[PDB]
């Protein structure tokens, strides 16, 4: 995540880029919950989906 | 809440040993596991933390 807010400023399609990870993201967090595995990695990745958001 | 830190803290470090950490029998402490102990103390947060 740290990668990707310093790919986010750079290029165009910013209000673009900001929704679509939102949806990658989150999405990716509740299939991965679906398996649970370690959530803490699912909690994490909802808070970047907060982050996004 | 010194409990709840500790685990915690633990399981930032590493999840693995964190595990073995609660599973493990307390030869001192009468031969019993954390978990035990815990619910014995009917302490809700060291329960209701991730890990356990």
């Given at each position: 995540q740290k990668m990707a807010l310093f790919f986010w400023?750079?290029?165009?399609?910013a209000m673009a880029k900001a929704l679509v990870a939102c949806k990658l993201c989150k999405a990716m967090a509740h299939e991965a919950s679906e398996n649970d595995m370690v959530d803490d990695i699912s909690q994490e990745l909802n808070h970047n989906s907060r982050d996004f958001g | 809440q010194l409990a709840v830190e500790l685990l915690d803290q633990s399981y930032k470090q590493d999840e693995q040993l964190a595990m073995k950490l609660l599973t493990y029998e307390l030869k001192n402490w009468s031969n019993a596991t954390c978990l035990q102990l815990a619910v014995a103390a009917k302490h809700r947060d060291f329960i209701a933390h991730t890990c356990s």
């Open positions: 400023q750079h290029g165009e399609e | -």
